[PDB]
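Q: Structure for this?
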Amino acid sequence: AMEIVYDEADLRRYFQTAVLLDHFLDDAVEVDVDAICDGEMVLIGGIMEHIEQAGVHSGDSACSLPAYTLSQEIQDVMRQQVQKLAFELQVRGLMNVQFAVKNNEVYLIEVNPRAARTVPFVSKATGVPLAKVAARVMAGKSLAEQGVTKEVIPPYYSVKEVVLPFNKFPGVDPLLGPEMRSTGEVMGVGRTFAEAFAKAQLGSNSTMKKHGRALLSVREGDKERVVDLAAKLLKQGFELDATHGTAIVLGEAGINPRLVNKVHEGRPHIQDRIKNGEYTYIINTTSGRRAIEDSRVIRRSALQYKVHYDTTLNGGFATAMALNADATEKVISVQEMHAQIK
Amino acid sequence: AMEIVYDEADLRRYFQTAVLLDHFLDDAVEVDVDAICDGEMVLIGGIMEHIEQAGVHSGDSACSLPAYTLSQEIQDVMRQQVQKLAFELQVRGLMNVQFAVKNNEVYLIEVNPRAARTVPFVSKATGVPLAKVAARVMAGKSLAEQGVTKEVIPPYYSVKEVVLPFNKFPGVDPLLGPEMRSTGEVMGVGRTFAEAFAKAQLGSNSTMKKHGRALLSVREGDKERVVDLAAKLLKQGFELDATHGTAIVLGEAGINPRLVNKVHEGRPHIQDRIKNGEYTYIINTTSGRRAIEDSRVIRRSALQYKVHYDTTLNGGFATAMALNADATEKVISVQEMHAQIK
Ligand SMILES: Nc1ncnc2c1ncn2[C@@H]1O[C@H](COP(=O)(O)OP(=O)(O)O)[C@@H](O)[C@H]1O
Ligand SMILES: Nc1ncnc2c1ncn2[C@@H]1O[C@H](COP(=O)(O)OP(=O)(O)O)[C@@H](O)[C@H]1O
Ligand SMILES: O=c1[nH]cnc2c1ncn2[C@@H]1O[C@H](COP(=O)(O)O)[C@@H](O)[C@H]1O
Ligand SMILES: O=c1[nH]cnc2c1ncn2[C@@H]1O[C@H](COP(=O)(O)O)[C@@H](O)[C@H]1O
Ligand SMILES: NCCC[C@H](N)C(=O)O
Ligand SMILES: NCCC[C@H](N)C(=O)O
Ligand SMILES: [Cl-]
Ligand SMILES: [Cl-]
Ligand SMILES: [K+]
Ligand SMILES: [K+]
Ligand SMILES: [K+]
Ligand SMILES: [K+]
Ligand SMILES: [Mn+2]
Ligand SMILES: [Mn+2]
């Protein structure tokens, strides 16, 4: 049971219900890097930039291949670091490295000297049978002999999205965290990131609509950013609703959402509205055990009433960008995909 | 110490704190009636409809001659009740009657068998020197004999507004109630109620503006009428702020004010905003001792910073109308006014 502790009090509190201790890189981009090491050289299979930030298990984050926001200069740090790590541990075959980017600063989160659950996606994305290769490598044939020496960078956008079992265990709080709960995955391919993403979202069984009313209820650290997001939804013709504190910040920015009541606050409240088909979209962020626990009802209602919802601001943005795309506009075969690869 | 208690708890509460017990006529129109009785007949000198409802001392209420909302039918009833009273108590000279209208029903508040403070204004408004006339009657000269037998209903509107000393005693909660606190009064003469009012308002040293942002923070009972108020303001070009509860009702009605925190809710709050010059107008109603005591800050801030404020919705509405008039437009002398009385 891993948990993010915010303060001293918090510490104890976990401790009771309860040891490695790590500092939580808040407001960090999480990255996945799959690579092969033949001993001579190192092939970078792919660099995946997660939509959801560090603190939300790789296993449950959507991810984009190539990175949709990261700087070449930084990818480059990780590129260099992995190489460094590959040779150092003596990687003979596949490997995976997970980083965390915070303030143009690369932090090593973990190294998995084996096949990661990211390979296939990465293989599909790049047209490079990553496993076959490391397989051939482990046995004795080099990256060099394989003529599999250069790192591929597709002409298109490959986004990976996950599917969660929440609907099977309704008593659970359908919320993202440090622990993985997802069962499967989908892949979205688009000319643009927004395209790919919309593809991955539709593919993941999302109920997200392109119209109606959105509900914004975010955590403190998300209050600043939520503005742009809200701006985006307004531009798309979404009508807005917001909880008190979230409504405060919005207003301070020229945006006047409809104020909605929390459960304990009166009527009607979020639950009633949700239940009444009042929303087509919900952006809900929450931080801290107690808070989470207290906000449970919205997520539960949302899931239950099939309202598309995001539990990360990063995830809200993606959802928004995707509103500008048409996931049924254009299809492309995988063979065509790899054909496009020079 | 004259207070209005709402519930049993309230009763006691006062009782510890502190006997005549009267049923409070909530949401009632207060009226003043000045008249003369020569024992032979009764002369109606003036029927004044207060802007502020019963519960706000007559002396601190703005008022209009002729009535601006009362039905002729209801006024006529009053006129008869006055007559009755006059005769019965043996009035010989001036008299004054105070009523409350609730649900198309007339209630007697009190009877002051003497010259009331409304006498000068009524005189000015009607061109009839009630004091002189009444003095005559007292002296033996009858109404018939003096040739003053018909009630005068002027061709223009006369609005009286008061001035309060709260500024002199910053420590006092600048709020209206059942006890009189005002030191003076002014008169506004207009072709319409809106005009008389605007004139009365301006002469009262009101800092009211015709543009800007308005703060709405009203009590439960006022939550319903507030919407129309908000609309009217919106129409006038004003922008809107509002406290939580008030915002909620507004939202439900299609009005999305900009949310503002209560002093104790955090920042940014009303005090901050008021202080910073965000508002040009403030509409704040509050009921019940504790509630009053708690909101005190909003009223104290409004005054200190010179923002125009109304503590009654009836007042807020009058203000609203006045926005549609120009007190600097037309001027009229008393002589001219009296001359129009045919
Ligand atoms: N120090 C940290 N700061 C931020 N996020 C972290 C940190 N450690 C772990 N995480 C998050 O938790 C996830 C799981 O941690 P990780 O060490 O990779 O565990 P696992 O072995 O279960 O895959 C990561 O994918 C990441 O989102
Ligand atoms: N029963 C009542 N219902 C509503 N308002 C009332 C009632 N009794 C008095 N008031 C309010 O209190 C004020 C003062 O009461 P009043 O009997 O006229 O006392 P005073 O001797 O001060 O003139 C009135 O002008 C009115 O606004
Ligand atoms: O009905 C509720 N009860 C408790 N918490 C809620 C409820 N609805 C939303 N929240 C949480 O409220 C937070 C936003 O609060 P705000 O700061 O007042 O806008 C988010 O972290 C939400 O998950
Ligand atoms: O800063 C404050 N502290 C306490 N009460 C306030 C404050 N500002 C406004 N009020 C009161 O809040 C009421 C409106 O509350 P609302 O229903 O949440 O909008 C009014 O009756 C106001 O007098
Ligand atoms: N990639 C995880 C699934 C996303 C889900 N809508 C959430 O934001 O909670
Ligand atoms: N007629 C009394 C003055 C009104 C004041 N603006 C208030 O509404 O409190
Ligand atoms: Cl369950
Ligand atoms: Cl003082
Ligand atoms: K992540
Ligand atoms: K691991
Ligand atoms: K009154
Ligand atoms: K009296
Ligand atoms: Mn991991
Ligand atoms: Mn009285």
